[PDB]
């Protein structure tokens, strides 16, 4: 089963910049044909892919000439020569030269622009929480980018990390800024034991930690 | 030309399924019927591919034995059989139109989804949270309504009849323990957040449930 290797994992260019993706194989997918059978696929998000170039460097019938492949052997690259806001998605490999075919990794390709601050937030759990016998602690860190972001709960100065909810949004629209949900869920009586609740935000934009915390005590 | 695939299906843990793929508007039975899996997380994947007009199939090594490929001549569909059904094989799973060293999958199903857990249809438990009361008040302050316990997705999570479509930030749904947990967060000024009214209209068509209920200031 020849291996198909997409590299970068994902490629920040703004709009109106050339991108370049890049495939390797683990073997040759040369053809006797004298055809090399490599095809690129844009999958945007909940929809199914769709077929951009096939034979390295064919276009399918309907795909803007921005688009453009290339390559030989085990190297094969395609160019996107001026990004739009269309072109968001996820780059796949496909070879069709050996069986089984085999697909790339992919290539998430996002959009950069001027670095945004979060915005941290934290929400104590509700009345209905407590009736129900739970706790519910959400920290809200919105608008932040890049990625760079991560959380870590120092419940009354120690640090918990077992039950940790990881939760992130893709890149939005309008602003184009990432967001976070993470949160931990606590028992009444784990939940009233301590004292302080606190929820760090660590970013590039800031690099000392975000705090924001109350206290179970009030 | 159209792939028409079954609708999303909930499984235990040990079962098996049998998924389907009806294509129409082409000679069905001289395409290989390609099979992608593509988990939540990332990636596609193929399973293998089946050429209806014979019988012969292909199976990547990583599913050979787990999924089993038919056709059916007579209606124009294409089955696909996963065996001892678990966590891993919960995605979405997809059928393409494909035929070797030429026409590239130019076509592709819609996708069909497939979960493996052994839960119930449990409706939601919406918990409404307002802003804690050690916590300063400023110009822009961000509300929450938390989504949990339910299954099986999705839970359409909204605002009254659209009040706010823009700011708001609904986060991707995560497996806490073995429901599913979501949240949400929108934007609005102090000054008309008392007089103006929004609640978040949580759904669940999978357990026909249709509850909504907003927070109330601390
Ligand atoms: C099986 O043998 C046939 C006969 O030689 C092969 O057909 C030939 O395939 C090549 C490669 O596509 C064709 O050249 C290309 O033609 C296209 C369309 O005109 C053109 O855009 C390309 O620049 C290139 O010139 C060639 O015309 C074609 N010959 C005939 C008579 O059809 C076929 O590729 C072989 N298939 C396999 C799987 O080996």
């Known amino acids: 089963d020849v291996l198909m290797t997409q590299t970068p994992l994902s490629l920040p260019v703004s709009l109106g910049d050339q991108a370049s993706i890049s495939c390797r194989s683990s073997q040759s997918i040369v053809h006797s044909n004298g055809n090399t059978y490599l095809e690129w696929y844009l999958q945007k998000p909940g929809q199914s892919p769709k077929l951009l170039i096939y034979?390295?460097?064919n276009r399918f019938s309907g795909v803007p000439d921005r688009f453009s492949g290339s390559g030989s052997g085990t190297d094969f690259t395609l160019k996107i020569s001026r990004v739009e806001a269309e072109d968001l998605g996820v780059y796949y490999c496909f070879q069709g030269s050996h069986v089984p075919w085999t697909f790339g990794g992919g290539t998430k390709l996002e959009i950069k622009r001027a670095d945004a601050a979060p915005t941290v937030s934290i929400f104590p759990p509700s009345s209905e929480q407590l009736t129900s016998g739970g706790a519910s602690v959400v920290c809200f860190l919105n608008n932040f980018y890049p990625k760079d972001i991560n959380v870590k709960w120092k419940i009354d100065g120690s640090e918990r990390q077992n039950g940790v909810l990881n939760s992130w949004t893709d890149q939005d629209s309008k602003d184009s800024t990432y967001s976070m949900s993470s949160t931990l869920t606590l028992t009444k009586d784990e939940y009233e034991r301590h004292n302080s609740y606190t929820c760090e935000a660590t970013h590039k934009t800031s690099t000392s930690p975000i705090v924001k915390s109350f206290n179970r005590n009030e | 030309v159209q792939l028409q695939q079954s609708g999303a299906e909930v499984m235990k843990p040990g079962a098996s399924v049998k998924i389907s793929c009806k294509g129409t508007?082409?000679?069905?039975?001289?395409?290989?019927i390609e099979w992608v899996k593509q988990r939540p997380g990332h990636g596609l994947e193929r399973i293998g591919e089946?050429?209806?007009?014979?019988?012969?199939?292909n199976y990547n090594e990583k599913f050979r034995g787990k999924a089993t490929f038919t056709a059916d001549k007579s209606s124009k569909t294409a089955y696909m059989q996963l065996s001892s059904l678990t966590s891993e094989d919960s995605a979405v799973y997809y059928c393409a139109r494909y035929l070797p060293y030429y026409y590239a999958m130019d076509y592709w199903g819609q996708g069909t989804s497939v979960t493996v857990s052994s839960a119930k249809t449990t409706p939601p438990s919406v918990y409404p949270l307002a802003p804690g009361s050690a916590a300063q008040t400023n110009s822009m302050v961000t509300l929450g309504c938390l989504v949990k316990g339910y299954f099986p997705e999705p839970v359409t999570v909204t605002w009254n009849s659209g009040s706010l479509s823009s700011g708001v930030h609904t986060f991707p749904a995560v497996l806490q323990s073995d429901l599913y947990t979501l949240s949400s967060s929108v934007t609005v000024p102090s000054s008309t957040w008392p007089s103006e009214t929004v609640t978040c209209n949580v759904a669940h068509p999978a357990s026909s449930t249709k509850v909504d209920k907003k927070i109330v200031p601390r």
């Open positions: 034979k390295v460097s």
């Open positions: 508007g082409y000679t069905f039975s001289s395409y290989w």
């Open positions: 089946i050429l209806p007009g014979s019988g012969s199939t």
